[PDB]
Amino acid sequence: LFGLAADRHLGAHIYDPANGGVLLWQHLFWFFGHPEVYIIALPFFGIVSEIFPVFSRKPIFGYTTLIYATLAIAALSVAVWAHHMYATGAVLLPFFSFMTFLIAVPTGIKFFNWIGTMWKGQLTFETPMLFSVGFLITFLLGGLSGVLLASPPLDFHVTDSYFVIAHFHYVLFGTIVFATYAGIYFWFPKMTGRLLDERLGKLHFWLTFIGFHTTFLVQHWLGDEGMPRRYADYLPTDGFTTLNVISTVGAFILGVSMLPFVWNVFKSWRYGEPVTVDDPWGYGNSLE
């Protein structure tokens, strides 16, 4: 960023096309960009890993192995940065494809450990568990779509279209929406001393789930038919018109879904049910 400001304010000949700066900047940016997307993933893995054992009345299945999964995912997500640059035709294709395939192994381990945690135990499905399960369902399809992008032949046709937009709105909508809300519902009493409503926290979840799957599911098809991203408008004789209407309807549902949540937080912060115990969730494991 300092280098770019130097060019824009001093005329510093850093990112000149003649100077090989068109690709220098992309390398510099994508060394950041992908570790960034793994900065906002692992912490929200932690939340679900803390929520599963409590409501399952069973220990987290695999404690030693999850640490290694985290370490492997973090270490791998430094040498995978040019899989965002396929159409450029200027990177070593094999190097960034194999490693990107490899960064998909421990994620399955995490999934299977979660499934094994919630296996053969009494489950009650309060709001935290409902959100954390929605996380599983969304993130699986997100990751499945993400693996397809890793192969250069498929990214040759798919890249820079709404298929990728469909992808990173599932893998990103599970960690920082579903897991975030799971954490909020989990730790609200511990931080405030009040209990969030239950009949008002399930309407919110169902609205969010239905709205999200209504607005983002058809984007794969849009990108496949040949609709490019970052287009302001299109022509009537383009074919893709009705899918845009469906997406807009879903987006307005997803936008109205958030009223009950904010209402719940506003109402229950000072007139909520009082928790006077040390743990309102019963089979809590951690030291908080």
Contact residues: Mg ion, CB under 5 A: 160
Check: CB of residue 198 under 8 Å from CB of residue 126. Answer: yes
278 in helix, strand or coil? coil
Q: Which residues contact 88 (CB under 8 A, 6 or more apart)?
A: 23, 26
By the rule CB under 6 A, 69 interacts with ligand HEA: no
Quick one: 235 or 277, whose CB is closer to Cu ion? 235
Residue 72 CB, nearest approach to another protein (Å): 9
Distance CA 176, CA 45 (A): 10
Residues 39-68 that bind ligand HEA (CB under 6 A): 41
Contact code string over 146-165 relative to ligand HEA, x by CB under 6 A: xx-xx----x---x----x-
**β-sheet bridge partners, residue 195:** 273
Residue 276 interacts with, from Cu ion, another protein, Mg ion, none (CB under 5-8 Å by kind): none
By the rule CB under 5 A, 167 interacts with Cu ion: no
Quick one: 160 or 203, whose CB is closer to another protein? 160
Angle, helices 127-149/179-192, rounded to nearest 10 degrees: 150
- Which one of the spans 84-92, 143-151, 165-173, 200-208 is the region binding Cu ion (CB under 5 A)? 84-92
| Selected binder of another protein within 127, 132, 159, 219 (CB under 8 A) | 159
Residue 165 CB, nearest approach to Mg ion (Å): 12
Q: Which residues contact 87 (CB under 8 A, 6 or more apart)?
A: 155, 156, 159, 160
Task: Pick the closest to residue 217 from 243, 196, 235 (CA basis).
Answer: 243
In this structure, what token pair is assigned to residue 268? 């229950």
Contact code string over 188-227 relative to ligand HEA, x by CB under 6 A: ----------------------------------------
Distance CA 90, CA 216 (A): 32
Check: CB of residue 117 under 8 Å from CB of residue 56. Answer: yes
| Selected binder of Cu ion within 9, 23, 25, 34 (CB under 5 A) | 34
Return the residue nearest Mg ion (CB atom).
Answer: 160
Q: Is the dihedral of CA 200, 205, 210, 211 positive or negative?
A: positive
Q: Which residues contact 180 (CB under 8 A, 6 or more apart)?
A: 44, 47
- Count of residues engaged in binding ligand HEA, rule: CB under 6 A: 23
Quick one: 88 or 248, whose CB is closer to Mg ion? 88
Residues that bind ligand HEA (CB under 6 A): 37, 41, 83-84, 100, 103-104, 107-108, 111, 140, 143-144, 146-147, 149-150, 155, 159, 164, 168, 171-172
